Write an enzyme that holds these catalytic residues in place. Structure first.
Site, short mmCIF file in Angstrom:
data_model
loop_
_atom_site.label_atom_id
_atom_site.label_comp_id
_atom_site.label_asym_id
_atom_site.label_seq_id
_atom_site.Cartn_x
_atom_site.Cartn_y
_atom_site.Cartn_z
N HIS A 1 6.30 9.97 -4.85
CA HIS A 1 7.66 10.27 -5.33
C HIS A 1 8.24 11.37 -4.46
CE1 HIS A 1 6.42 8.34 -9.40
NE2 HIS A 1 6.41 7.51 -8.34
N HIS B 1 13.14 6.02 -7.33
CA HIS B 1 11.72 5.95 -7.58
C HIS B 1 10.84 6.67 -6.55
CE1 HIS B 1 8.15 3.49 -9.30
NE2 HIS B 1 7.74 4.61 -8.73
N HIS C 1 1.95 5.36 -1.67
CA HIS C 1 3.16 5.46 -2.43
C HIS C 1 3.28 6.83 -3.06
CE1 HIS C 1 6.24 4.94 -5.50
NE2 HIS C 1 5.40 4.97 -6.50
N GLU D 1 0.21 -0.43 -9.53
CA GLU D 1 0.95 -0.95 -8.41
C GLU D 1 0.04 -1.72 -7.44
OE1 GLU D 1 4.80 0.87 -9.47
OE2 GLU D 1 4.11 -1.05 -8.67
N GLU E 1 12.44 13.52 15.92
CA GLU E 1 11.26 12.68 16.08
C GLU E 1 11.36 11.38 15.29
OE1 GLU E 1 8.58 15.50 13.94
OE2 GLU E 1 9.86 15.17 12.24
ZN LIG Z 1 5.81 5.38 -8.58
#
Ligand SMILES: [Zn+2]
Ligand SMILES: [Zn+2]
Ligand SMILES: [Zn+2]
Ligand SMILES: [Zn+2]
Ligand SMILES: [Zn+2]
Ligand SMILES: [Zn+2]
Ligand SMILES: [Zn+2]
Lengths: 274, 274, 274, 274, 274, 274, 274
Positions: free
Chosen positions: E143, E212, E141, E117, E171
């Site tokens: 999951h 994702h 990133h 990525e 918050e």
């Molecule tokens: Zn991923």
């Protein structure tokens, strides 16, 4: 000399915030903890006192807390990091002789300041002192997951919330017979929410902030943590039960009363009446 | 000499209470654990015996337990703290020659006493000894989350609860073929709930207390913890299934019978009949 | 609450006795250490106070020490084991209101008693208090190897021993300008050797017991340990030098005087005169 | 951010002082260590910079060191405690723009100041920079036991001391081909001994202070520690040899020359001439 | 020298990936993290630079990132293993002078390459630099469980998702006033999803990839982790609430507005309008 | 020599079983793990081979596994305890020259035997060897919570289960493009379930046992654990989504196809056709 | 996979070099260690093999060592640091098919090279292989303190040195019945000293380098370390005895002979004849 970081109170703050982090109650800087101390607790540790204690005025005068030292979590600081760097995330503050403000004796390095919920903490300490003849020493706030979730689904009412939590675990009546007070949602970090919380603290040891979290009071770090943990365990049970379609049987009014009698506790009347 | 805290039985107690704490089964002082020992287990450790063993009478005489030593959790003590300070949270007690009371040989410092569920523990040890020809040595109680949740939603009946738990994980029939007995809700910490539990213990190794928790018995700390863990894993599965709308397929009566035959176990009849 | 074993004073006792064990100064039960405390130091730790404090009379009344708490090493206990089991090897004692005896508040488990050199310790604390206006708080005794060896080979005289130790390491004059007093050999563990030691303590912070060891006094555990370590480093150097045939050059009287002047210290006259 | 205590330079300082403590070279506050840094080394660590850097004038101006940051041991601090509390025992200082003084950016808590041998350190850094075109970055001082002992028994002369140390271990010529300079005994902690040391540092990487200890310079903490360790290992061997009656055979002038040739090193002439 | 594995940035990468693993957000090789560094961060660590830096071309030129070093997770590497073997799972890469590619200075042993990525990461760093005047330095990133679950049940629309997340914890508005952007599902690991993500990053600090996971940006590892944790805590609450039948009360528009005013934040208009 | 317990394979078995225990997948003795080794892996470790290797016949001959060593979990042993006592819970077995049985070279102390699912393990190893040209080396079984729950609620069909798991997390198609095979419920611990599992293993790397658990195969411990973890993460997402009322949007057939094309994987046809 | 640093051979090299460092035998880069391996030892660890193995020619061809892998200490590397960073200080090298050179498969990072005593190591391995029919696998060199000291004071003769070492500890005859060979002093790090050492290795397992150190050979790291440790313990005793004026009684020839007979060892004739 042993460093103040090895003291009973810094180690206890480390334990409680780390335990609360593992529970998933304190994402980011969520939650704040404040523990009242004595002069004796900090006397051994002068070697660690900043030379020029920073002075910060209190939101409003609090003469009942004059000359009282406290260890507190910092504004914007992560519970997860208290065990990694206590001085960066905790602070020892002492209220001045006339309750107008406090000095930062230790910690809160890099210009950190006490939690932005300081009003709520100090106003509540102040009320819990009156309510318990000085037995309470801790005010703990955290984003207890299931307790938050239930504020979107149950009636935000002291009596109905107290009764539901009592039903969600046999011990609850015994642990919090005075029940849990619920405020209406309020903007956090203000004197107003502080005041409302302190007000609820005259009658309860647990106070809920809808869509936000819980506040607890107790004689020690372990009992306050335990108090919240009990309420949240109950909430956890309730969230599973409501997810299964609801109570098909539960602890009844008669049983709550028998329970209060065996443990010599007088249950909050509004919640028992339901 | 090595300190009694490094002994097999204090280490074992630390492991089981810490594991149970990490499971989220023992908030505050929830749960209690008692382990039967021999004279040989504590013989090496006289250096750690209090000089003036405190004597405390048993709720009721228990001659079958005369002269038997046990390690127990204390009343109001947190499972979370057993690893931090064993002596403050655990205690070694020995029942006197005629079963009338016991002496506190070690631990339970600061005037702590054995768990307030001591009746339930000792009465059940006493029945499990008869039912297993002395093979069982542990009685464990904890606030197993999913098992508690299910008591608000399933029929509180031995047969239906047993069958549902057997269906929730293939191994359950094998691990607890005698099934799980359910009592009506009762005031905890009494001789009555103790008696009722002990009574259920003649027929089952697992007993549920509605809206409260579970009690298990086994030969060792690991198997007893394992026994409860199995039942709670099953409950966890059931909670997810009921949250998904219910069983659309499940382990059938025929399958449970094939299973009992392959593992040489005779399943509790009332539960298999459903 | 955090257990007293995690306190600054038990941790400090653990450090000093373990460090002394690693140095090879404390074979078997050789050596003993006593540290004066305040009420504030022990106030947090009541949960660990024995219910029935054992009372033991002092060899002789010591009113200047009335109501004073101390942490001490036990009689027959090994420095090597203090880190393994603090309560078995250390004890917190408090002198009663009229100096006639003391109560054992914590530790000294299994009927252990304070060091058999208690007289020497308490009499010296008492003199060091007078000599330093309460700045000294520690009395440490150990079997410092090279210092012992030198007592078989140098004149057992305060002046000549002081001058030799001063010469064996530049810093020595500065660390112990009052020099080191030498007693004649005496039977250990008596009031007489205690008295003689206390007497020497009015004029020196270091006292040697021929064929036996050393005694040191100081404001903190680290400085007292450091004080002895300095004297023993010097002795170590001297033992190598004498093993090489003796001093062929050394620190002269003129240089000792220059040294005392630069560090604002007034060297013991008898030793400078040599 | 990671705390500056986990940085490469605080960790390195911890390693070298702890190693030196275990060697028995640094009783009490004996020894001191200073390491030259870059701006890049401390850039990541601003969160740990005191808000109001204490300013302290240098004994004498040192423009060649302007704007240079250093990590140093504190005056009166124990090498043994650096690992326990880095901030209390170490400090990061930065020399101001015109070499007149320095600011204490970090550490040296409780009003501690840099080592009282700061003159000797800074003056020597300053000369070692000129002598090595900035390759040297460390100045270490310690009470190396055998090296000290030998100053009472060998001629305190650069050439004879160098030759004896070269003979005491084959690698010595290779490790310190410029040999070791010996000063006359001087009052420590002054500008004079500082100056004399710095002066010796133009020609040697090792300098001895009779009846006191050694000073070494090198590119890194490890090499400087290694350099001193080599010299002290040699001294240790010599002490055993002289204790056995003296050299009956040794490394000869011819051999030392063959050795210098194989390692491309040019041995200090005065020492080789003996 | 201290090994680069003990540096602030490898230790920080270890902490973030290990914390994310414990959260259950990074099964297998799920997630990827990249942190922008300075020359000063890696200057001390040349001893650890591979001799022959592998060169790999960037998917597309990125001149704004020229000469910038970064520490990144590897393709197919497990967050769970970062703490066990940093060099095998992390890498230091430096973009060349004209943004055409990068050199692997350290790590990514056994021919590993940066996360697949990487486009999404670098393109987003690049946009976050423009949007924050270089204050942001991290792209993370993972999951995040509940956030993923919610993408199957809520309208995949920036405004409605942002408002729901804001409601799920008081918050949230304060932590992510710019809200969270949602993309349509896209094939991962491409320039296209990278571009789309970078584009969303101009207006939000959080971006969701339906079915994702999430992408977050912030000034430090802790704040970016905290940012995602906050969003995921809110999602966790929402999943319990929707499992209980839905919101029966919630944070209202009026309250969100009062909240933005007290914290001096301007809430994303589309989400406030709902 | 280093003890076999420090070997790569015992350490790896400890890691996987501990990780699976922390996941809550292996209550009591639930699960079992077997890893194929080479002669080279165990060659260094003969000092730890039992003198009289116990011989145990295989359920049925397996000549393709002749002379192959494996490390396996024991029957009735707890994953939780593997880290505490590897030899009591694991064993190294080697299949004899004609595949008729195996010798226990190490571990399985106290007369323990390999997992009672040995048939399933060995039969599957044997098929995975054929299907992958020897690349697979691990067979792992565990009671993955959400995967179990889903077997009571989804159609127990390879195609529909595979498609649902693929939809529950984008990566799933990529990680297990051959999908997951589902068996009908069968009595565990038999050759029949072993055979059926091995049979399913010819076409899938993941096999589900309804109301029981999952079986996975892979080249290494980490990938096999990762494979199951992926499947279970997806199931965890599905359980939350079904608890929220079901998919309102999801990964479509077209998107699955685009996904398989970008990752060069050919998705199981029956599952894509749905 | 587990990283090669956890392998038996890296762990063993760490142990031996750390142990030797704690003994004070390896100041700076003093000493070097090389251990012969097999293909099987390193087979599991290809993930850690450098992509482009550096090739370095051997001082002179050594066909008896063709294709043989070894783990070695690096040139200029400190034994003290092996535990801290194995790859920076150790290396795995493999001799090519015709004994002309070797490839560096792992470690020796930052362009480090094998010990500059490589000739001595490889030549000796080569002779010890012939003399023991491949049983020896280790060559260790260190600066054993007392053994060095004795080379300045005893006749540097194989026979007299051997007899003195045999007398200095009863076990010595049994541990090194072939005695210890002494070379004349030689320039270190050359083929000549390597050859001379290898030559002495045909008849002894211990070889002394006057004014330098010792070389030992053995089947394993522990026995080789033990062999040197025995010799050095004996030397330590001798140094104390010579420092006390010399042997007044000692192990006689008759007793050495009885000793060799009881342990089935044939003592070096020249040393027994004295
Ligand atoms: Zn991923
Ligand atoms: Zn809050
Ligand atoms: Zn209970
Ligand atoms: Zn003594
Ligand atoms: Zn000095
Ligand atoms: Zn199973
Ligand atoms: Zn050497």
């Amino acid at each position: 000399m042993q460093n103040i970081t090895q003291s009973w109170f810094v180690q206890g703050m480390i334990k409680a915030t780390t335990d609360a982090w593992l529970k998933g109650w304190d994402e980011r800087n969520g939650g704040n903890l404040t523990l009242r101390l004595d002069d004796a607790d900090i006397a051994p540790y002068h070697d660690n006192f900043h030379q020029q204690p920073r002075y910060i005025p209190l939101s409003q005068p609090m003469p009942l807390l004059a000359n009282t030292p406290f260890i507190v979590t910092g504004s914007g600081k992560f519970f997860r990091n208290v065990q990694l760097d206590p001085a960066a995330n905790l602070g020892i503050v002492k209220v001045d002789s006339d309750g107008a403000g406090y000095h930062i004796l230790w910690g809160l390095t890099n210009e950190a300041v006490p939690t932005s919920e300081l009003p709520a903490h100090f106003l509540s300490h102040c009320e819990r002192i009156k309510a318990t003849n000085g037995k309470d020493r801790v005010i703990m706030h955290c984003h207890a997951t299931n307790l938050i979730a239930l504020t979107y689904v149950l009636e935000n009412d002291t009596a109905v919330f107290t009764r539901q939590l009592w039903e969600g675990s046999t011990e609850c009546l015994v642990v919090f017979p005075d029940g849990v007070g619920i405020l209406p949602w309020m903007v956090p970090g203000t004197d107003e929410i502080g005041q409302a919380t302190a007000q609820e603290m005259q009658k309860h040891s647990l106070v809920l902030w809808p869509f936000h979290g819980v506040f607890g009071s107790g004689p020690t770090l372990d009992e306050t943590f335990g108090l919240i943990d009990t309420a949240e365990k109950s909430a956890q049970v309730l969230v599973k039960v409501y997810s299964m379609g609801g109570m098909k049987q539960t602890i009844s009014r008669e049983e709550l009363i028998a329970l209060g009698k065996r443990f010599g506790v007088t249950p909050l009347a509004s919640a028992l009446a339901l």
